Design an enzyme around this catalytic site. Structure first.
Site, mmCIF file in Angstrom:
data_model
loop_
_atom_site.group_PDB
_atom_site.id
_atom_site.type_symbol
_atom_site.label_atom_id
_atom_site.label_comp_id
_atom_site.label_asym_id
_atom_site.label_seq_id
_atom_site.Cartn_x
_atom_site.Cartn_y
_atom_site.Cartn_z
ATOM 1 N N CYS A 10 0.828 -1.198 0.000
ATOM 2 C CA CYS A 10 0.000 0.000 0.000
ATOM 3 C C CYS A 10 0.867 1.254 0.000
ATOM 4 C CB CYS A 10 -0.926 -0.063 1.217
ATOM 5 S SG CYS A 10 -1.581 1.510 1.795
ATOM 6 N N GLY A 11 0.764 2.126 -0.997
ATOM 7 C CA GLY A 11 1.563 3.339 -1.076
ATOM 8 C C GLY A 11 1.425 4.223 0.160
#
Ligand SMILES: [Cs+]
Ligand SMILES: [Cs+]
Ligand SMILES: [Cs+]
EC number: 1.20.4.1
Length: 138
Positions: A10-11
């Site tokens: 997840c960025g």
């Protein structure tokens, strides 16, 4: 003493982890998808984050869709037990520091609970500037 419930895919979670490091500490990293919090730990995290149980629910994941969780037919404790049984439902990242606990969405929310200032400019992985070299929030 910092803990991050992290999803490396997840960025937002990656940016949050790098901001913690840029404040000069290496946090304990809990891969919550494989090592979720206990029920009491999860209840405490939610109380400390000051958000509702439902605000912590991650949408657009298989258990959210298939258990019909978009509909308003679930008590808070039903939702907590689904989170424990299906950890991908726990939105991310959660960060705990001596100053408090936050759901760090967007990632720069973490700046609220980091005790030490960023040590130099911080730019997110997609190029979005967050703090400049002087330390000002952009
Ligand atoms: Cs645990
Ligand atoms: Cs702060
Ligand atoms: Cs992004």
């Amino acid at each position: 003493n910092i803990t991050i419930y992290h999803n490396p895919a997840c960025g937002t979670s990656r940016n949050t982890l790098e901001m913690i490091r840029n404040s000069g500490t290496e946090p304990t990293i809990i891969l919550y998808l494989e090592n979720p919090p206990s029920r009491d730990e999860l209840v405490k995290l939610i109380a400390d984050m000051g958000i509702s149980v439902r605000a912590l629910l991650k949408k657009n994941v298989e258990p959210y869709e298939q258990l019909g969780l978009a509909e308003d037919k679930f008590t808070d404790d039903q939702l907590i037990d689904f989170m424990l049984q299906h950890p991908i439902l726990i939105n991310r990242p959660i960060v705990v520091t001596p100053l408090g606990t936050r759901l760090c969405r967007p990632s720069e929310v973490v700046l609220d609970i980091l005790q030490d200032a960023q040590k130099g400019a911080f730019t997110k992985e997609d190029g979005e500037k967050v703090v400049d070299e002087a330390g000002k929030r952009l």
